[PDB]
From Swiss-Prot:
Disruption phenotype: Mutants cev1 are dark green and contains more jasmonates and ethylene, that leads to shorter and thickened hypocotyls and roots, with prolific root hairs, and the accumulation of purple anthocyanins. They exhibit constitutive and high expression in leaves lamina of vegetative storage proteins (VSP1 and VSP2), basic chitinase CHI-B and plant defensin PDF1.2. In addition, this mutation confers resistance to powdery mildew pathogens such as E.cichoracearum, E.orontii and O.lycopersicum, to the bacterial pathogen P.syringae pv maculicola, and also to the green peach aphid M.persicae. The active site is at D46, D333. This is Cellulose synthase A catalytic subunit 3 [UDP-forming]. Belongs to the glycosyltransferase 2 family. Plant cellulose synthase subfamily. Residues 1-369 are cytoplasmic. Palmitoylated, in part by PAT24/TIP1. Expressed in young plants, flowers and roots, and to a lower extent in leaves and stems. Localized in all cells except meristematic cells. Accumulates particularly in root caps, root hairs, epidermal layer, midveins of leaves and anthers. Not present in old tissues. The chain holds residues 334 to 811 of 1065 of the full protein. Catalytic subunit of cellulose synthase terminal complexes ('rosettes'), required for beta-1,4-glucan microfibril crystallization, a major mechanism of the cell wall formation. Involved in the primary cell wall formation, especially in roots. UDP-alpha-D-glucose binds at S10, K16, E17, D46, K187. Mn(2+) binds at K188, D212. Residues 100-124 form a coiled coil. It is found in: Cell membrane; Golgi apparatus membrane. Homodimer. Interacts with CESA1 and CESA6. Interacts with STL1 and STL2, but not with GOT1. Binds to CSI1 and CSI3. Interacts with PAT24/TIP1.
Length: 369
């Protein structure tokens, strides 16, 4: 049995971070070998760059061609750029199947895409003094970076999309938490706690996979292998595979990029409570390993996802808390990453890319610092 997983990807600024690079990571996630209803992709853009938003839409719309291709022909790796970069052997077969026409078109599709992405960054460069207007005419809610409402936009999923062969793709969620002058947002950490919460009130996945914007999934079967190793008992703490895999087993430990951990361990309990004032959030707290209560209404939980990235949602709220993701006080100490606990039985599956001290350093690389 495979449980749903929510994969995280955070963004700060598209001109420091090439959309095309992060776009490749998102297409490797949308193409993963895993039930579409049990993988959800949440992309935070803490800058609120219209450019991030638009590139994310172009990517979502290219993914409708790309995912079925990757899935018909067992393409690996699931990121176009590196794939169309790898060597292929034309000499192997004596006859031309449809892969020839199909691969030649998909590559032409990919260059079309890069060009269209390039054109978006070309237009993001000259900044109009009167703010950003979207392609459809509508003004961008994010012209002021420190003053804008919370934004949530779903792509593909069960209500949009449909790849060209008529099947539905993983949900793709642009999130951008609220910014109002006067609220410390905890930049990268605040994005991530908020992102833990918004993904809880929507697709409440029992497992979470934060990925850096450039950490594309190399093996499309990563979550299948993850899942069948994440759920069974044995002894011994860390094991190693053949960059490569790790997978732990059996105080607090802090985990970051590129690791598949269970959601409940962020919460302190084993599924009064101050996770904030959202009872929908605390519902998903006490629910099963994951899942969203069927007693919940699409309009009411969009109402709450907006609520749970609002400004001041974390006020006195015990976030950056003794659990979850934590921050080190003014002038930024380094005390970061997610947090789990005595854990009872828990394990974690990561795919990275003195005696005790030298071992403590590598068992930190495997958790993405």
């Amino acid at each position: 049995q495979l449980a749903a997983v929510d994969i995280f990807v955070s963004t700060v600024d598209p001109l420091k971070e090439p959309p095309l690079v992060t776009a490749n990571t998102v297409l490797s996630i949308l193409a993963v070998d895993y039930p579409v209803d049990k993988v959800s992709c949440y992309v935070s853009d803490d800058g609120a760059a219209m450019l991030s938003f638009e590139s994310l839409a172009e990517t979502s719309e290219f993914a409708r061609k790309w995912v079925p291709f990757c899935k018909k022909y067992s393409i690996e790796p699931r990121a176009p750029e590196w794939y169309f970069a790898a060597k292929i052997d034309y000499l192997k077969d004596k006859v031309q199947t449809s892969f020839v026409k199909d691969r030649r078109a998909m590559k032409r599709e990919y260059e079309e895409f890069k060009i269209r992405i390039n054109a978006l960054v070309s237009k993001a460069l000259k900044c109009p003094e009167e703010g950003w207007v979207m392609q459809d005419g509508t003004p961008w809610p994010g012209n002021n970076t420190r003053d804008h409402p919370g934004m949530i936009q779903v792509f593909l999923g069960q209500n949009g999309g449909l790849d060209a062969e008529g099947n539905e793709l993983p949900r793709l969620v642009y999130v951008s938490r609220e910014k109002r002058p006067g609220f410390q947002h905890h930049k990268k950490a605040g994005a991530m706690n908020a992102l833990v919460r918004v993904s809880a009130v929507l697709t409440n996945g029992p497992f979470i996979l934060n990925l850096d914007c450039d950490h594309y999934i190399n093996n499309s079967k990563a979550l299948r292998e993850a899942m069948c190793f994440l759920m069974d008992p044995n002894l011994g703490k860390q094991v190693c595979y053949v960059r490569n895999t790790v997978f732990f087993d059996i105080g607090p430990v802090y985990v970051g990029t590129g690791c598949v951990f269970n959601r409940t361990a962020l919460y302190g309990y084993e599924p009064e409570k101050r996770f904030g004032q959202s009872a929908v959030f605390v519902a998903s707290t006490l629910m099963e390993n994951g899942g969203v209560p069927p007693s919940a209404t699409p309009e009411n939980l969009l109402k709450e996802a907006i609520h749970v990235i609002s400004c001041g949602y974390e006020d006195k709220s015990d976030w950056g808390m003794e659990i979850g993701w934590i921050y080190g006080s003014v002038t930024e100490d380094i005390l970061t990453g997610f947090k789990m606990h005595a854990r009872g039985w828990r394990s974690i599956y990561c795919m990275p890319k003195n005696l005790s001290d030298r071992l403590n350093q590598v068992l930190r690389w495997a958790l993405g610092s």
